[PDB]
């Protein structure tokens, strides 16, 4: 039997909030069967808890967010989900003792090695897939996403950029996903922003922990960063490490084929939610035999 991960132990981080710029510290923890990724915020008291859902999540100015029933939210939480997608974590609860996930740089990658420290356990209970069973397509403008039935994970990524430091070769990405596919090939990828729009916010006092250390910044022409990019289509990457994470909002690996055009978080999201509210578009499916387990789901 295929079964649900969790951790083996409790591990902690800290760095700053992209919004606050101050120091947040993050907590890892395990979590028996059944009971989800749970996000909880532990400078309010009583502190609170935000079950990764679908229909909690809201596209803020900066990343996302997710919101409770009287509106308290907690940021930034998309990069983390990704990698919890990756390594197949299914139940876990994560604390900061702040608004927001700590931005790291601006990547998925420092949550890959903090999982890797807090160890994989598998607990005696089978691990819920949800399997695409009818093509499933949302839109706004000339944008879309879509799933459609596949035995596996494919994303096939096009995002419309028309910056001079984005050329046209590196419009588009597409994967089979995997533990180790999205390790080697995505998770290292960062976020990123235009420079003039991040002094504008900055100067109204938000994005307060924005800096080279955590971001891809473009001015009008050309990539800021001392360095450069990590992949010549870094930023395409990156907004595929964002739809994993969107997807993951969930609570389940999908077997299915995404594909999207001009997609963010607010469509990715749309799709997730007009998937799940259509009964005869999805099923929960297990796998007793672990041969079955198509070729995206095996541990790393
Ligand atoms: C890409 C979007 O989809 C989205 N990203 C964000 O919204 C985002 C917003 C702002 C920043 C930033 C910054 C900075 C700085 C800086 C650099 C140098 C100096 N001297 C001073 C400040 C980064 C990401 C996302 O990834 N969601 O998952
Ligand atoms: C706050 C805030 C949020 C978004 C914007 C914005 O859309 N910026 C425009 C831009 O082109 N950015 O790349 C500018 C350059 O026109 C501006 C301010
Ligand atoms: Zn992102």
New binding site residues.
């Given amino acids: 039997m295929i079964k649900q991960r969790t951790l083996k132990r409790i591990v902690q981080a800290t760095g700053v909030g ?1 919004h606050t710029g101050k120091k947040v510290t993050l907590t890892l923890r395990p979590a028996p069967a059944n009971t989800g990724v749970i996000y909880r915020r532990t400078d309010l008291n009583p502190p609170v808890d935000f079950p990764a859902d679908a229909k909690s999540v809201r596209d803020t100015m ?3 967010c997710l919101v409770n029933e009287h509106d308290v939210r907690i940021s930034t939480v ?2 983390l989900n990704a990698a919890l997608a990756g390594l197949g974590i299914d139940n876990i609860v994560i604390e900061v003792n702040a608004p927001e996930i700590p931005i790291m740089d ?1 990547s998925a990658a420092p949550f890959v090695y903090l999982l890797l420290d807090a160890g994989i356990d598998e607990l005696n209970c089978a691990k819920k897939f949800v399997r695409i069973k009818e093509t499933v397509r949302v839109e706004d403008g000339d944008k879309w996403a879509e799933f459609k039935p596949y035995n596996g994970f494919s994303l096939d990524f096009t995002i419309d950029f028309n910056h001079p430091a984005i050329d046209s070769s590196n419009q588009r990405y597409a994967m089979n996903f995997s533990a180790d596919a999205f390790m080697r090939q995505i998770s290292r990828a960062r ?3 235009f420079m003039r729009d ?1 002094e504008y916010l900055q100067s109204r006092g938000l ?1 307060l922990g ?3 250390d ?2 891809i ?1 473009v001015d009008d022409y050309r990539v800021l960063n001392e360095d450069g990019l990590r992949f010549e289509d870094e930023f395409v990457r ?1 907004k595929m490490l ?1 739809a994993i994470g969107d997807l993951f909002m969930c609570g389940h690996n999908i077997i299915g084929a995404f594909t999207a055009y001009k997609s ?2 607010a469509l990715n999201n749309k799709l997730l939610q007009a998937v799940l509210a259509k009964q005869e578009a999805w099923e929960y499916v297990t796998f007793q035999d672990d041969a079955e387990l198509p070729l995206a789901f095996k541990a790393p």
């Fill in positions: 992209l900066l990343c996302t998309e990069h601006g976020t990123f922003g991040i994005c924005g800096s080279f955590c971001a910044v990156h964002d963010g978080h």
